Amino acid sequence: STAGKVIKCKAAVLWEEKKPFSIEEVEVAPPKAHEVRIKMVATGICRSDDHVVSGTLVTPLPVIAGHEAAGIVESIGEGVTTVRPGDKVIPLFTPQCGKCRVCKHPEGNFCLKNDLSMPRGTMQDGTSRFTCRGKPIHHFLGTSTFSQYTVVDEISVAKIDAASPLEKVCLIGCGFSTGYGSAVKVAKVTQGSTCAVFGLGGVGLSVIMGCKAAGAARIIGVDINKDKFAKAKEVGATECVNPQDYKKPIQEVLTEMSNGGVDFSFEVIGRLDTMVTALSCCQEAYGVSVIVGVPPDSQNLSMNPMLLLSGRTWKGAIFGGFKSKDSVPKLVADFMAKKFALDPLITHVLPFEKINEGFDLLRSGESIRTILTF
Amino acid sequence: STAGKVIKCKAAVLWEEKKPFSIEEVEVAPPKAHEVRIKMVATGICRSDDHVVSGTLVTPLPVIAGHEAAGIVESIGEGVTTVRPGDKVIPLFTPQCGKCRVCKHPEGNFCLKNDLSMPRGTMQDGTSRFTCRGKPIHHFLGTSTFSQYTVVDEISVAKIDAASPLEKVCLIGCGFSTGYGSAVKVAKVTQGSTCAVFGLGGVGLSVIMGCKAAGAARIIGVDINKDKFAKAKEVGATECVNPQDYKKPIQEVLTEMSNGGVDFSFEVIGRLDTMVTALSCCQEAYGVSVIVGVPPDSQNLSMNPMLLLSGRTWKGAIFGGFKSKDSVPKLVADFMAKKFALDPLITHVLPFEKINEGFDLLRSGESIRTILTF
Numbered sequence A, B: 001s002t003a004g005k006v007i008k009c010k011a012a013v014l015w016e017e018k019k020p021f022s023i024e025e026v027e028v029a030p031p032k033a034h035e036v037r038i039k040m041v042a043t044g045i046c047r048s049d050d051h052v053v054s055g056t057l058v059t060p061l062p063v064i065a066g067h068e069a070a071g072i073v074e075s076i077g078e079g080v081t082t083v084r085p086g087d088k089v090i091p092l093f094t095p096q097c098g099k100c101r102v103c104k105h106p107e108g109n110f111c112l113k114n115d116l117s118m119p120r121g122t123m124q125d126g127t128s129r130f131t132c133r134g135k136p137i138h139h140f141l142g143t144s145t146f147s148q149y150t151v152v153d154e155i156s157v158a159k160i161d162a163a164s165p166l167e168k169v170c171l172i173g174c175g176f177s178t179g180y181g182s183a184v185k186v187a188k189v190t191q192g193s194t195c196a197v198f199g200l201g202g203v204g205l206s207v208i209m210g211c212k213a214a215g216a217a218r219i220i221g222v223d224i225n226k227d228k229f230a231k232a233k234e235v236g237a238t239e240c241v242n243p244q245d246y247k248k249p250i251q252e253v254l255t256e257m258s259n260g261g262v263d264f265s266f267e268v269i270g271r272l273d274t275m276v277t278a279l280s281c282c283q284e285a286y287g288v289s290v291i292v293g294v295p296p297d298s299q300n301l302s303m304n305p306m307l308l309l310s311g312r313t314w315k316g317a318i319f320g321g322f323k324s325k326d327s328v329p330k331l332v333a334d335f336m337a338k339k340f341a342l343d344p345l346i347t348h349v350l351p352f353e354k355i356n357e358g359f360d361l362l363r364s365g366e367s368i369r370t371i372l373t374f
Ligand SMILES: NC(=O)c1ccc[n+]([C@@H]2O[C@H](COP(=O)([O-])OP(=O)([O-])OC[C@H]3O[C@@H](n4cnc5c(N)[nH+]cnc54)[C@H](O)[C@@H]3O)[C@@H](O)[C@H]2O)c1
Pocket: A045, A046, A047, A048, A051, A174, A175, A178, A198, A199, A200, A201, A202, A203, A204, A222, A223, A224, A225, A228, A243, A268, A269, A270, A271, A274, A291, A292, A293, A294, A295, A317, A318, A319, A320, A362, A368, B309
């Protein structure tokens, strides 16, 4: 029995930037008041985890990364009311406190209790539940899912269907929900519209899924890796284009293809240049462009505000605009009811001990999502 | 008595940037097919006209500027169906052809026949109706209202109520409609919200009017000229701030004042730095910022796209988002029914012959709108 005790378990510790994860024993403290300790079942490899490795995202190190996952509650601290030991759960990298001005707003989801903006790498109480070789180890986004066991604040976990296949629904913890919601909730793609999706990884494929669900007539996938095109078409892309194939800038190509600009464009890469290209390729008077990707820390883009003055709308979002704790259980129920598919995003399934090999698959271009299984 | 004949009349010709207008005789050709010749009655001085003089806005010179006006149809070309001689009309600097993909879109207004994006300074047929000293003179935005007579394409004119006071409703041709629509149509300001309005000229005052009409609870005016604050409060500002009074950047001041950011902000000046400040000061998860001010020609702003990734929406618009020919007559009818006031915008009245004094008043900071009478 482990309840109320320190757990010694295996985790993937990132000691410094641009190094492999170290798979080794950590100590996981028991949960405090309003905290939940979770036995991990499956976690996906999201590009945002790689950004921590590459230094694209700045967060306190050493760290246990991982934010796209699912597991089973091992124990609860005093005062927890929303989950119980044995429940299937998804950690929420965007919390839902329910009390802040954002949580109370009908269209906000970026709860003020988040650890993204100005990352501390801690629990809500400003402390860590992790140690390794006698050193405190930081949390990541309140989730830290690259560990056999994590501790999360109650506002950072959702209870899901007891019959959920956790090796699939972990993707609802980040990439699926983000892409799908970016299309259906943030952009509000319309029936009959033309969409352009920049970046055909797990998140961009989920954007395509959402654009198709919303009834788009044309969905143009854009990627410099033509090996991504077949799966993009399988999930709804009507055309795919590789910028490297053209003498013209791809905003000009997409404007010509769409007879004057697209209805909706999505940046799903993380480059400043593609954010401006994606804005430019939407129709100047009524186009909408959504930033989904994460670019390098502290870098500004340059753009001409006449792109906006003519009528364009430019927005971005975290986690597809979904209020995380309300939405995750409903997305899992919708998946269980066959309303969308997750298998098209899963290219590789590896044991957790092969985390580095999973990152190498992402970095090489081979994979979409690798699911690590504990 | 003048139908089919060249009209000799006085106009304000701009031969050179950074110089006074020259009030002198021009020759105004009769209207060709689908053209309308208008005897002007009143025209406002909008800062965009001054942008032509300063080179902030690049359009071919020499030019007859003016775009905010009202007059009476003197004659119609072959095939004109929407106005008749003797009708009161407002020229439309944003056309409404009714046929292009923007005109057909429910939310588009920046008609593809516009002369704003890449100005030619001509009629729709690529020619000029104006001669001065034997030289062809450019049109401006298809309107050229700084003339006793102008010729406009049919898609650039709207018939208005025959009982309209033209010395008031000329403001519906640019500044009032732009500001009011930016709030009520583009931003869609909500009841009980907090708004910030950067720039308290004629357009920014019109934005305040729209925010108040939409039921905003707080409307914070921002201007470096504190002489603008009294009138801003008269039309609905709940408080005014001068960035020059503060040690900290005004985005930080406004975020503090609004307990974490405003619901809606508006840039109504034309500066790259205030466009980014206005975006920053709206709440990071659900705020909306609208660019109204005209930026300096060909200059790019610099900004961190993390401002959008958190959830902000950034947009701009021409003419308040209003489909011009549909909307202008309705706005005049609503003015006639006292649904909004125009007198708060009118600080000065001059004869057309004193156009240069009218620009001096705008440049000194003294005026809001000067209305010129022909
Ligand atoms: N906003 C959010 O909440 C959120 C959620 C999840 C992921 N992300 C970010 O979204 C982005 C995509 O994540 P992912 O799908 O896991 O990554 P991924 O699987 O690496 O996919 C990125 C795709 O972009 C392609 N690509 C790279 N450069 C270019 C280019 N110049 N032009 C066109 N295509 C290019 C690349 O070939 C690949 O297929 C990353 O920046 C993530 O950090 C954001």
